[PDB]
Amino acid sequence: KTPPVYPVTVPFLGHIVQFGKNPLEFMQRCKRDLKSGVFTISIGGQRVTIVGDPHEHSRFFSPRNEILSPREVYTIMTPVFGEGVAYAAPYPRMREQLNFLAEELTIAKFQNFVPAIQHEVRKFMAENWKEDEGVINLLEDCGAMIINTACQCLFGEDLRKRLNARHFAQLLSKMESSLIPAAVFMPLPLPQSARCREARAELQKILGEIIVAREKEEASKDNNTSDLLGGLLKAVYRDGTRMSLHEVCGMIVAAMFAGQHTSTITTSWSMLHLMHPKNKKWLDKLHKEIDEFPAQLNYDNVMDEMPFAERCVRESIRRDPPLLMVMRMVKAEVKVGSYVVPKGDIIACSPLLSHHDEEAFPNPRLWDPERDEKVDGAFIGFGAGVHKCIGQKFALLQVKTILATAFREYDFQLLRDEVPDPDYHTMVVGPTLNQCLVKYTRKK
Ligand code: HEM
Ligand SMILES: O=C(N[C@@H](Cn1ccnc1)c1ccccc1)c1ccc(-c2ccc(Cl)cc2)cc1
């Protein structure tokens, strides 16, 4: 009934060093030996059960919060967002908040986002690269465009005056450094947390000033309105109470914190694969889809007249997933396949491992946009079941618009021998930085 177990040498540390070493091979090794998609590591004296069989994915995403709580595994962000936030609040209360945020991001509000994106990317592009031939670092250049572009989308004219794009990105960085690597459960705000403390206060203060001047204008029936934040102001709690500054501040940061890293990486990988002598066959196929539109795109042609472009962004995520793995605690015993897991254990499901199973994908390491899964429910890049990612629709529309606006004017060329390798150092994994140098050209 119990799952198979791996044997450790030292009692003090369980397979921690092996993790630091590339874990893709490590995890594969085990699966081939114990011949099973389910086993337990027991890391650092603390058992951890991995579910790594495409067939069993539903036994893990389908179950409710009372049986499997997410609050406990992630407890460090708690410290970052605000006090008593998500995972920082009662489930009945938390569940409520997710919904207000979700409504903000919907197809019903994408109407005016497109043309705004093109402007920002063109502004930056025409000033940052000016010579006919130049050398730039892609990974560093996709990060600037992602940040400056969202704000055009979600911040009000008056809110951008008191906060520029550049400055804001710096503010987010300080909070991140608070992240502690190797801070394994279990061990508290440290000096790096002292900076994190300051950053939010400065962000909390500036919010108040924009409100006072907006209300008088909000008074008088100001015509524009439309701010997501404004939409957030109206929100009414179920019992019958309105949101406090503290919480609003928290939600906003959340939105901004989640988007930047993941989208950037996704964009970066997509341009590399696409500029290589090998992947030439599919480079034409793209031009066969972007040489009909005018110089000014509109909502329609990007949502429904760009099907294939969407097939490229997918394969990229599938092959090199930004997020290594998701986890949760077991408040009660749960059945899995032909085995069962006791109570008080830690169970995890890995996108990285699943995307490399031979049964679902014939060749895991190859890059093909026209491939299809042989087993239904294998991919799970954007998550699944009850916990499904929200920014999905938004991130895609933004990523697609960028690709479209760049290949139309510039032609890129990679200097290195072959596509860059992954770097497992950080917690959110993207391509290695020193291999990203590229040379750009210009048509016409
Ligand atoms: C490549 C882009 C993205 C990827 C790969 C991604 C991935 C994921 C994954 C794997 C989960 C579930 C993790 C778990 O089960 O604990 C998730 C959930 C979530 N994501 Fe994303 N996401 C992306 C974009 C975004 C964006 C743009 C936002 C906000 C603007 C966002 C906010 C959230 C939130 C609030 C959840 C809560 C999950 C829940 O409902 O329990 N994500 N995402
Ligand atoms: O950051 C988060 N998630 C991932 C990165 N990510 C990107 C897209 N999808 C996931 C992550 C990245 C790095 C470390 C851990 C997790 C995260 C952000 C916000 C909230 C949240 C929860 C409840 C409320 Cl009401 C509002 C917001 C939860 C999680």
Side-chain angles (χ1 to χ4, degrees), residues 114-129 141-142 144-146 148-150 152 297 398 401-407 409-410:
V114 196
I117 299 185
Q118 283 205 213
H119 160 82
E120 275 315 358
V121 64
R122 270 169 171 157
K123 173 170 178 168
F124 165 102
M125 195 161 305
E127 97 67 29
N128 291 115
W129 323 332
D141 285 334
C142 300
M145 312 178 81
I146 290 295
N148 301 354
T149 211
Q152 212 65 6
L297 297 169
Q398 159 187 312
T401 294
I402 290 185
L403 290 187
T405 303
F407 283 63
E409 312 193 31
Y410 292 85

PDB file of all heavy atoms in Angstrom, residues 114-129 141-142 144-146 148-150 152 297 398 401-407 409-410:
ATOM      1  N   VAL A 114      -4.535  46.063 -27.158  1.00  0.00           N
ATOM      2  CA  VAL A 114      -3.654  45.770 -28.293  1.00  0.00           C
ATOM      3  C   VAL A 114      -2.824  46.978 -28.741  1.00  0.00           C
ATOM      4  O   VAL A 114      -1.601  46.977 -28.591  1.00  0.00           O
ATOM      5  CB  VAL A 114      -4.428  45.197 -29.500  1.00  0.00           C
ATOM      6  CG1 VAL A 114      -3.464  44.548 -30.480  1.00  0.00           C
ATOM      7  CG2 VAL A 114      -5.466  44.192 -29.041  1.00  0.00           C
ATOM      8  N   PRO A 115      -3.487  48.011 -29.291  1.00  0.00           N
ATOM      9  CA  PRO A 115      -2.805  49.192 -29.827  1.00  0.00           C
ATOM     10  C   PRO A 115      -1.863  49.857 -28.824  1.00  0.00           C
ATOM     11  O   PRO A 115      -0.903  50.515 -29.224  1.00  0.00           O
ATOM     12  CB  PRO A 115      -3.961  50.135 -30.171  1.00  0.00           C
ATOM     13  CG  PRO A 115      -5.114  49.235 -30.424  1.00  0.00           C
ATOM     14  CD  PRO A 115      -4.950  48.101 -29.454  1.00  0.00           C
ATOM     15  N   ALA A 116      -2.138  49.684 -27.534  1.00  0.00           N
ATOM     16  CA  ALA A 116      -1.294  50.251 -26.484  1.00  0.00           C
ATOM     17  C   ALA A 116       0.032  49.509 -26.404  1.00  0.00           C
ATOM     18  O   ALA A 116       1.083  50.108 -26.173  1.00  0.00           O
ATOM     19  CB  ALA A 116      -2.007  50.202 -25.142  1.00  0.00           C
ATOM     20  N   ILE A 117      -0.026  48.198 -26.598  1.00  0.00           N
ATOM     21  CA  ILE A 117       1.174  47.379 -26.566  1.00  0.00           C
ATOM     22  C   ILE A 117       2.126  47.745 -27.709  1.00  0.00           C
ATOM     23  O   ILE A 117       3.323  47.922 -27.491  1.00  0.00           O
ATOM     24  CB  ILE A 117       0.828  45.870 -26.583  1.00  0.00           C
ATOM     25  CG1 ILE A 117       0.000  45.510 -25.348  1.00  0.00           C
ATOM     26  CG2 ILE A 117       2.090  45.021 -26.637  1.00  0.00           C
ATOM     27  CD1 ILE A 117      -0.297  44.039 -25.212  1.00  0.00           C
ATOM     28  N   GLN A 118       1.595  47.881 -28.920  1.00  0.00           N
ATOM     29  CA  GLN A 118       2.429  48.216 -30.069  1.00  0.00           C
ATOM     30  C   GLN A 118       3.220  49.508 -29.859  1.00  0.00           C
ATOM     31  O   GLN A 118       4.396  49.591 -30.214  1.00  0.00           O
ATOM     32  CB  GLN A 118       1.592  48.310 -31.344  1.00  0.00           C
ATOM     33  CG  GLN A 118       1.207  46.966 -31.930  1.00  0.00           C
ATOM     34  CD  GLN A 118       0.943  47.040 -33.422  1.00  0.00           C
ATOM     35  OE1 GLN A 118       0.104  46.316 -33.953  1.00  0.00           O
ATOM     36  NE2 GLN A 118       1.661  47.925 -34.105  1.00  0.00           N
ATOM     37  N   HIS A 119       2.571  50.515 -29.282  1.00  0.00           N
ATOM     38  CA  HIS A 119       3.216  51.807 -29.051  1.00  0.00           C
ATOM     39  C   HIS A 119       4.466  51.675 -28.182  1.00  0.00           C
ATOM     40  O   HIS A 119       5.543  52.140 -28.558  1.00  0.00           O
ATOM     41  CB  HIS A 119       2.222  52.800 -28.431  1.00  0.00           C
ATOM     42  CG  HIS A 119       2.868  53.961 -27.737  1.00  0.00           C
ATOM     43  ND1 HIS A 119       3.319  55.078 -28.408  1.00  0.00           N
ATOM     44  CD2 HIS A 119       3.120  54.184 -26.425  1.00  0.00           C
ATOM     45  CE1 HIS A 119       3.831  55.934 -27.540  1.00  0.00           C
ATOM     46  NE2 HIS A 119       3.721  55.417 -26.330  1.00  0.00           N
ATOM     47  N   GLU A 120       4.321  51.030 -27.027  1.00  0.00           N
ATOM     48  CA  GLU A 120       5.434  50.892 -26.090  1.00  0.00           C
ATOM     49  C   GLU A 120       6.626  50.159 -26.687  1.00  0.00           C
ATOM     50  O   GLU A 120       7.773  50.569 -26.501  1.00  0.00           O
ATOM     51  CB  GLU A 120       4.982  50.207 -24.798  1.00  0.00           C
ATOM     52  CG  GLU A 120       4.375  51.161 -23.789  1.00  0.00           C
ATOM     53  CD  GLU A 120       5.185  52.436 -23.646  1.00  0.00           C
ATOM     54  OE1 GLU A 120       6.242  52.545 -24.308  1.00  0.00           O
ATOM     55  OE2 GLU A 120       4.768  53.330 -22.877  1.00  0.00           O
ATOM     56  N   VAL A 121       6.353  49.073 -27.400  1.00  0.00           N
ATOM     57  CA  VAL A 121       7.416  48.271 -27.991  1.00  0.00           C
ATOM     58  C   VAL A 121       8.123  49.030 -29.116  1.00  0.00           C
ATOM     59  O   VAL A 121       9.325  48.868 -29.326  1.00  0.00           O
ATOM     60  CB  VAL A 121       6.893  46.904 -28.499  1.00  0.00           C
ATOM     61  CG1 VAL A 121       5.890  47.092 -29.628  1.00  0.00           C
ATOM     62  CG2 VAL A 121       8.046  46.023 -28.946  1.00  0.00           C
ATOM     63  N   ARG A 122       7.374  49.865 -29.829  1.00  0.00           N
ATOM     64  CA  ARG A 122       7.953  50.672 -30.898  1.00  0.00           C
ATOM     65  C   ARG A 122       8.763  51.843 -30.354  1.00  0.00           C
ATOM     66  O   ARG A 122       9.808  52.191 -30.901  1.00  0.00           O
ATOM     67  CB  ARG A 122       6.869  51.166 -31.856  1.00  0.00           C
ATOM     68  CG  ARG A 122       6.611  50.209 -33.001  1.00  0.00           C
ATOM     69  CD  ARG A 122       5.365  50.574 -33.780  1.00  0.00           C
ATOM     70  NE  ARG A 122       5.250  49.773 -34.995  1.00  0.00           N
ATOM     71  CZ  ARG A 122       4.109  49.542 -35.635  1.00  0.00           C
ATOM     72  NH1 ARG A 122       2.972  50.046 -35.173  1.00  0.00           N
ATOM     73  NH2 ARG A 122       4.104  48.801 -36.735  1.00  0.00           N
ATOM     74  N   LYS A 123       8.276  52.444 -29.276  1.00  0.00           N
ATOM     75  CA  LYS A 123       8.991  53.530 -28.621  1.00  0.00           C
ATOM     76  C   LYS A 123      10.368  53.064 -28.161  1.00  0.00           C
ATOM     77  O   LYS A 123      11.389  53.636 -28.542  1.00  0.00           O
ATOM     78  CB  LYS A 123       8.184  54.055 -27.434  1.00  0.00           C
ATOM     79  CG  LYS A 123       8.912  55.081 -26.585  1.00  0.00           C
ATOM     80  CD  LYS A 123       7.973  55.722 -25.578  1.00  0.00           C
ATOM     81  CE  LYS A 123       8.709  56.712 -24.693  1.00  0.00           C
ATOM     82  NZ  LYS A 123       7.765  57.548 -23.901  1.00  0.00           N
ATOM     83  N   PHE A 124      10.384  52.020 -27.341  1.00  0.00           N
ATOM     84  CA  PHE A 124      11.629  51.443 -26.839  1.00  0.00           C
ATOM     85  C   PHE A 124      12.547  50.993 -27.973  1.00  0.00           C
ATOM     86  O   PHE A 124      13.741  51.286 -27.975  1.00  0.00           O
ATOM     87  CB  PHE A 124      11.321  50.258 -25.919  1.00  0.00           C
ATOM     88  CG  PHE A 124      12.508  49.378 -25.642  1.00  0.00           C
ATOM     89  CD1 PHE A 124      13.200  49.477 -24.445  1.00  0.00           C
ATOM     90  CD2 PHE A 124      12.929  48.446 -26.578  1.00  0.00           C
ATOM     91  CE1 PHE A 124      14.293  48.666 -24.189  1.00  0.00           C
ATOM     92  CE2 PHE A 124      14.020  47.633 -26.328  1.00  0.00           C
ATOM     93  CZ  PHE A 124      14.704  47.744 -25.133  1.00  0.00           C
ATOM     94  N   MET A 125      11.974  50.281 -28.937  1.00  0.00           N
ATOM     95  CA  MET A 125      12.738  49.698 -30.031  1.00  0.00           C
ATOM     96  C   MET A 125      13.508  50.738 -30.841  1.00  0.00           C
ATOM     97  O   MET A 125      14.678  50.538 -31.167  1.00  0.00           O
ATOM     98  CB  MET A 125      11.804  48.910 -30.949  1.00  0.00           C
ATOM     99  CG  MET A 125      12.508  47.965 -31.902  1.00  0.00           C
ATOM    100  SD  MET A 125      11.379  46.714 -32.547  1.00  0.00           S
ATOM    101  CE  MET A 125      10.757  46.008 -31.025  1.00  0.00           C
ATOM    102  N   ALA A 126      12.851  51.849 -31.160  1.00  0.00           N
ATOM    103  CA  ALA A 126      13.432  52.864 -32.037  1.00  0.00           C
ATOM    104  C   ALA A 126      14.519  53.707 -31.375  1.00  0.00           C
ATOM    105  O   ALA A 126      15.243  54.434 -32.055  1.00  0.00           O
ATOM    106  CB  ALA A 126      12.340  53.761 -32.605  1.00  0.00           C
ATOM    107  N   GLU A 127      14.634  53.617 -30.052  1.00  0.00           N
ATOM    108  CA  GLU A 127      15.639  54.398 -29.335  1.00  0.00           C
ATOM    109  C   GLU A 127      16.790  53.524 -28.836  1.00  0.00           C
ATOM    110  O   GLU A 127      17.948  53.944 -28.848  1.00  0.00           O
ATOM    111  CB  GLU A 127      15.009  55.170 -28.168  1.00  0.00           C
ATOM    112  CG  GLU A 127      15.141  54.488 -26.812  1.00  0.00           C
ATOM    113  CD  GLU A 127      16.582  54.431 -26.321  1.00  0.00           C
ATOM    114  OE1 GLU A 127      17.375  55.324 -26.689  1.00  0.00           O
ATOM    115  OE2 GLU A 127      16.921  53.494 -25.566  1.00  0.00           O
ATOM    116  N   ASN A 128      16.465  52.307 -28.407  1.00  0.00           N
ATOM    117  CA  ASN A 128      17.459  51.403 -27.833  1.00  0.00           C
ATOM    118  C   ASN A 128      18.371  50.775 -28.877  1.00  0.00           C
ATOM    119  O   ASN A 128      19.580  50.677 -28.676  1.00  0.00           O
ATOM    120  CB  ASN A 128      16.778  50.322 -26.997  1.00  0.00           C
ATOM    121  CG  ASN A 128      16.150  50.878 -25.737  1.00  0.00           C
ATOM    122  OD1 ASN A 128      14.931  50.846 -25.572  1.00  0.00           O
ATOM    123  ND2 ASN A 128      16.981  51.408 -24.845  1.00  0.00           N
ATOM    124  N   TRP A 129      17.784  50.340 -29.986  1.00  0.00           N
ATOM    125  CA  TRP A 129      18.563  49.880 -31.125  1.00  0.00           C
ATOM    126  C   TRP A 129      18.441  50.909 -32.236  1.00  0.00           C
ATOM    127  O   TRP A 129      17.342  51.166 -32.727  1.00  0.00           O
ATOM    128  CB  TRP A 129      18.061  48.529 -31.632  1.00  0.00           C
ATOM    129  CG  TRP A 129      17.617  47.581 -30.564  1.00  0.00           C
ATOM    130  CD1 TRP A 129      18.057  47.528 -29.273  1.00  0.00           C
ATOM    131  CD2 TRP A 129      16.664  46.520 -30.708  1.00  0.00           C
ATOM    132  NE1 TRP A 129      17.422  46.510 -28.599  1.00  0.00           N
ATOM    133  CE2 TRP A 129      16.564  45.876 -29.459  1.00  0.00           C
ATOM    134  CE3 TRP A 129      15.881  46.058 -31.771  1.00  0.00           C
ATOM    135  CZ2 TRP A 129      15.712  44.792 -29.245  1.00  0.00           C
ATOM    136  CZ3 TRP A 129      15.036  44.984 -31.556  1.00  0.00           C
ATOM    137  CH2 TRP A 129      14.958  44.363 -30.303  1.00  0.00           C
ATOM    138  N   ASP A 141      16.767  42.435 -22.611  1.00  0.00           N
ATOM    139  CA  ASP A 141      15.942  43.338 -23.407  1.00  0.00           C
ATOM    140  C   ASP A 141      14.466  42.941 -23.429  1.00  0.00           C
ATOM    141  O   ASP A 141      13.600  43.765 -23.710  1.00  0.00           O
ATOM    142  CB  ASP A 141      16.492  43.445 -24.833  1.00  0.00           C
ATOM    143  CG  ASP A 141      17.750  44.296 -24.910  1.00  0.00           C
ATOM    144  OD1 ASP A 141      17.930  45.170 -24.034  1.00  0.00           O
ATOM    145  OD2 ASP A 141      18.555  44.093 -25.845  1.00  0.00           O
ATOM    146  N   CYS A 142      14.181  41.679 -23.133  1.00  0.00           N
ATOM    147  CA  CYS A 142      12.801  41.220 -23.069  1.00  0.00           C
ATOM    148  C   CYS A 142      12.188  41.583 -21.728  1.00  0.00           C
ATOM    149  O   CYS A 142      10.968  41.657 -21.595  1.00  0.00           O
ATOM    150  CB  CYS A 142      12.721  39.711 -23.291  1.00  0.00           C
ATOM    151  SG  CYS A 142      13.358  39.162 -24.888  1.00  0.00           S
ATOM    152  N   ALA A 144      12.737  44.478 -20.081  1.00  0.00           N
ATOM    153  CA  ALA A 144      12.375  45.889 -20.073  1.00  0.00           C
ATOM    154  C   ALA A 144      11.049  46.123 -20.793  1.00  0.00           C
ATOM    155  O   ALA A 144      10.251  46.968 -20.388  1.00  0.00           O
ATOM    156  CB  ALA A 144      13.476  46.717 -20.708  1.00  0.00           C
ATOM    157  N   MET A 145      10.823  45.366 -21.862  1.00  0.00           N
ATOM    158  CA  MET A 145       9.624  45.521 -22.673  1.00  0.00           C
ATOM    159  C   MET A 145       8.395  44.948 -21.969  1.00  0.00           C
ATOM    160  O   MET A 145       7.287  45.469 -22.113  1.00  0.00           O
ATOM    161  CB  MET A 145       9.819  44.859 -24.040  1.00  0.00           C
ATOM    162  CG  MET A 145      11.135  45.227 -24.714  1.00  0.00           C
ATOM    163  SD  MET A 145      11.403  44.408 -26.304  1.00  0.00           S
ATOM    164  CE  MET A 145      10.421  45.441 -27.389  1.00  0.00           C
ATOM    165  N   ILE A 146       8.599  43.879 -21.206  1.00  0.00           N
ATOM    166  CA  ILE A 146       7.511  43.249 -20.469  1.00  0.00           C
ATOM    167  C   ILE A 146       6.982  44.155 -19.368  1.00  0.00           C
ATOM    168  O   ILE A 146       5.772  44.253 -19.160  1.00  0.00           O
ATOM    169  CB  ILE A 146       7.949  41.918 -19.837  1.00  0.00           C
ATOM    170  CG1 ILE A 146       8.177  40.859 -20.919  1.00  0.00           C
ATOM    171  CG2 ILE A 146       6.909  41.444 -18.825  1.00  0.00           C
ATOM    172  CD1 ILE A 146       6.925  40.464 -21.674  1.00  0.00           C
ATOM    173  N   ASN A 148       7.446  47.655 -18.990  1.00  0.00           N
ATOM    174  CA  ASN A 148       6.902  48.899 -19.528  1.00  0.00           C
ATOM    175  C   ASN A 148       5.594  48.712 -20.294  1.00  0.00           C
ATOM    176  O   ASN A 148       4.872  49.676 -20.546  1.00  0.00           O
ATOM    177  CB  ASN A 148       7.929  49.584 -20.433  1.00  0.00           C
ATOM    178  CG  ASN A 148       9.225  49.902 -19.713  1.00  0.00           C
ATOM    179  OD1 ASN A 148       9.337  49.723 -18.499  1.00  0.00           O
ATOM    180  ND2 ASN A 148      10.216  50.376 -20.460  1.00  0.00           N
ATOM    181  N   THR A 149       5.289  47.473 -20.663  1.00  0.00           N
ATOM    182  CA  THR A 149       4.135  47.201 -21.513  1.00  0.00           C
ATOM    183  C   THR A 149       2.865  46.945 -20.701  1.00  0.00           C
ATOM    184  O   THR A 149       1.770  47.357 -21.096  1.00  0.00           O
ATOM    185  CB  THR A 149       4.408  46.012 -22.459  1.00  0.00           C
ATOM    186  OG1 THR A 149       3.688  46.193 -23.684  1.00  0.00           O
ATOM    187  CG2 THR A 149       3.997  44.697 -21.809  1.00  0.00           C
ATOM    188  N   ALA A 150       3.014  46.284 -19.575  1.00  0.00           N
ATOM    189  CA  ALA A 150       1.871  45.980 -18.756  1.00  0.00           C
ATOM    190  C   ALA A 150       1.226  47.231 -18.253  1.00  0.00           C
ATOM    191  O   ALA A 150       0.017  47.366 -18.276  1.00  0.00           O
ATOM    192  CB  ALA A 150       2.303  45.168 -17.601  1.00  0.00           C
ATOM    193  N   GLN A 152       1.149  50.120 -19.475  1.00  0.00           N
ATOM    194  CA  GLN A 152       0.345  50.820 -20.426  1.00  0.00           C
ATOM    195  C   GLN A 152      -1.003  50.156 -20.290  1.00  0.00           C
ATOM    196  O   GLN A 152      -2.026  50.798 -20.300  1.00  0.00           O
ATOM    197  CB  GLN A 152       0.894  50.610 -21.818  1.00  0.00           C
ATOM    198  CG  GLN A 152       0.682  51.784 -22.723  1.00  0.00           C
ATOM    199  CD  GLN A 152       1.434  53.017 -22.265  1.00  0.00           C
ATOM    200  OE1 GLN A 152       2.205  52.969 -21.314  1.00  0.00           O
ATOM    201  NE2 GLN A 152       1.212  54.130 -22.945  1.00  0.00           N
ATOM    202  N   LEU A 297      -2.190  46.634 -35.847  1.00  0.00           N
ATOM    203  CA  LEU A 297      -3.013  45.481 -35.494  1.00  0.00           C
ATOM    204  C   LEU A 297      -4.208  45.882 -34.635  1.00  0.00           C
ATOM    205  O   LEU A 297      -4.162  46.886 -33.924  1.00  0.00           O
ATOM    206  CB  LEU A 297      -2.177  44.437 -34.747  1.00  0.00           C
ATOM    207  CG  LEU A 297      -1.002  43.780 -35.474  1.00  0.00           C
ATOM    208  CD1 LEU A 297      -0.141  42.995 -34.495  1.00  0.00           C
ATOM    209  CD2 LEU A 297      -1.491  42.881 -36.600  1.00  0.00           C
ATOM    210  N   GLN A 398      -0.313  39.168 -24.975  1.00  0.00           N
ATOM    211  CA  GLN A 398       0.842  40.056 -24.912  1.00  0.00           C
ATOM    212  C   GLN A 398       2.059  39.460 -25.625  1.00  0.00           C
ATOM    213  O   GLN A 398       2.715  40.132 -26.423  1.00  0.00           O
ATOM    214  CB  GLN A 398       1.168  40.380 -23.454  1.00  0.00           C
ATOM    215  CG  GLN A 398       2.585  40.858 -23.203  1.00  0.00           C
ATOM    216  CD  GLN A 398       2.890  41.003 -21.723  1.00  0.00           C
ATOM    217  OE1 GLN A 398       2.117  41.595 -20.971  1.00  0.00           O
ATOM    218  NE2 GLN A 398       4.021  40.455 -21.295  1.00  0.00           N
ATOM    219  N   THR A 401       1.691  39.482 -29.510  1.00  0.00           N
ATOM    220  CA  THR A 401       1.790  40.803 -30.131  1.00  0.00           C
ATOM    221  C   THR A 401       3.241  41.240 -30.291  1.00  0.00           C
ATOM    222  O   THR A 401       3.595  41.917 -31.256  1.00  0.00           O
ATOM    223  CB  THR A 401       1.026  41.876 -29.326  1.00  0.00           C
ATOM    224  OG1 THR A 401      -0.380  41.601 -29.367  1.00  0.00           O
ATOM    225  CG2 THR A 401       1.280  43.254 -29.910  1.00  0.00           C
ATOM    226  N   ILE A 402       4.079  40.853 -29.336  1.00  0.00           N
ATOM    227  CA  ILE A 402       5.485  41.218 -29.385  1.00  0.00           C
ATOM    228  C   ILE A 402       6.189  40.533 -30.549  1.00  0.00           C
ATOM    229  O   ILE A 402       6.843  41.194 -31.355  1.00  0.00           O
ATOM    230  CB  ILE A 402       6.211  40.908 -28.064  1.00  0.00           C
ATOM    231  CG1 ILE A 402       5.731  41.861 -26.967  1.00  0.00           C
ATOM    232  CG2 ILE A 402       7.711  41.047 -28.240  1.00  0.00           C
ATOM    233  CD1 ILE A 402       6.469  41.708 -25.658  1.00  0.00           C
ATOM    234  N   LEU A 403       6.052  39.214 -30.643  1.00  0.00           N
ATOM    235  CA  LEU A 403       6.655  38.481 -31.751  1.00  0.00           C
ATOM    236  C   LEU A 403       6.275  39.119 -33.079  1.00  0.00           C
ATOM    237  O   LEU A 403       7.129  39.363 -33.929  1.00  0.00           O
ATOM    238  CB  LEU A 403       6.210  37.018 -31.754  1.00  0.00           C
ATOM    239  CG  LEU A 403       6.711  36.095 -30.647  1.00  0.00           C
ATOM    240  CD1 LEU A 403       6.286  34.671 -30.957  1.00  0.00           C
ATOM    241  CD2 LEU A 403       8.220  36.196 -30.503  1.00  0.00           C
ATOM    242  N   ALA A 404       4.985  39.385 -33.248  1.00  0.00           N
ATOM    243  CA  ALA A 404       4.472  39.915 -34.503  1.00  0.00           C
ATOM    244  C   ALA A 404       5.137  41.234 -34.882  1.00  0.00           C
ATOM    245  O   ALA A 404       5.452  41.468 -36.048  1.00  0.00           O
ATOM    246  CB  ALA A 404       2.964  40.086 -34.423  1.00  0.00           C
ATOM    247  N   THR A 405       5.352  42.091 -33.890  1.00  0.00           N
ATOM    248  CA  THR A 405       5.863  43.434 -34.138  1.00  0.00           C
ATOM    249  C   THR A 405       7.379  43.474 -34.337  1.00  0.00           C
ATOM    250  O   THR A 405       7.931  44.490 -34.767  1.00  0.00           O
ATOM    251  CB  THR A 405       5.465  44.399 -33.001  1.00  0.00           C
ATOM    252  OG1 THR A 405       4.039  44.408 -32.856  1.00  0.00           O
ATOM    253  CG2 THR A 405       5.953  45.810 -33.300  1.00  0.00           C
ATOM    254  N   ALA A 406       8.069  42.391 -34.031  1.00  0.00           N
ATOM    255  CA  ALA A 406       9.518  42.411 -34.177  1.00  0.00           C
ATOM    256  C   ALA A 406      10.038  41.817 -35.457  1.00  0.00           C
ATOM    257  O   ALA A 406      10.905  42.369 -36.094  1.00  0.00           O
ATOM    258  CB  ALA A 406      10.168  41.740 -33.013  1.00  0.00           C
ATOM    259  N   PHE A 407       9.515  40.672 -35.831  1.00  0.00           N
ATOM    260  CA  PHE A 407      10.011  40.016 -37.015  1.00  0.00           C
ATOM    261  C   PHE A 407       9.693  40.791 -38.266  1.00  0.00           C
ATOM    262  O   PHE A 407      10.340  40.634 -39.285  1.00  0.00           O
ATOM    263  CB  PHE A 407       9.569  38.564 -37.069  1.00  0.00           C
ATOM    264  CG  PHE A 407      10.359  37.681 -36.156  1.00  0.00           C
ATOM    265  CD1 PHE A 407      10.321  37.866 -34.801  1.00  0.00           C
ATOM    266  CD2 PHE A 407      11.171  36.701 -36.652  1.00  0.00           C
ATOM    267  CE1 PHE A 407      11.055  37.066 -33.960  1.00  0.00           C
ATOM    268  CE2 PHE A 407      11.902  35.908 -35.807  1.00  0.00           C
ATOM    269  CZ  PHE A 407      11.842  36.093 -34.467  1.00  0.00           C
ATOM    270  N   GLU A 409      10.197  43.859 -38.798  1.00  0.00           N
ATOM    271  CA  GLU A 409      11.115  44.956 -39.097  1.00  0.00           C
ATOM    272  C   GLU A 409      12.581  44.547 -39.004  1.00  0.00           C
ATOM    273  O   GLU A 409      13.428  45.084 -39.717  1.00  0.00           O
ATOM    274  CB  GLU A 409      10.857  46.137 -38.160  1.00  0.00           C
ATOM    275  CG  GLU A 409       9.392  46.519 -38.030  1.00  0.00           C
ATOM    276  CD  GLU A 409       9.200  47.869 -37.364  1.00  0.00           C
ATOM    277  OE1 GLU A 409      10.081  48.742 -37.522  1.00  0.00           O
ATOM    278  OE2 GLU A 409       8.165  48.061 -36.689  1.00  0.00           O
ATOM    279  N   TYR A 410      12.877  43.597 -38.122  1.00  0.00           N
ATOM    280  CA  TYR A 410      14.253  43.177 -37.878  1.00  0.00           C
ATOM    281  C   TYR A 410      14.491  41.711 -38.227  1.00  0.00           C
ATOM    282  O   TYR A 410      13.557  40.908 -38.263  1.00  0.00           O
ATOM    283  CB  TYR A 410      14.623  43.409 -36.412  1.00  0.00           C
ATOM    284  CG  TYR A 410      14.713  44.864 -36.015  1.00  0.00           C
ATOM    285  CD1 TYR A 410      13.584  45.570 -35.623  1.00  0.00           C
ATOM    286  CD2 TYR A 410      15.932  45.530 -36.025  1.00  0.00           C
ATOM    287  CE1 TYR A 410      13.664  46.901 -35.256  1.00  0.00           C
ATOM    288  CE2 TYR A 410      16.024  46.860 -35.661  1.00  0.00           C
ATOM    289  CZ  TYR A 410      14.888  47.542 -35.277  1.00  0.00           C
ATOM    290  OH  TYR A 410      14.979  48.865 -34.914  1.00  0.00           O
TER     291      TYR A 410
END
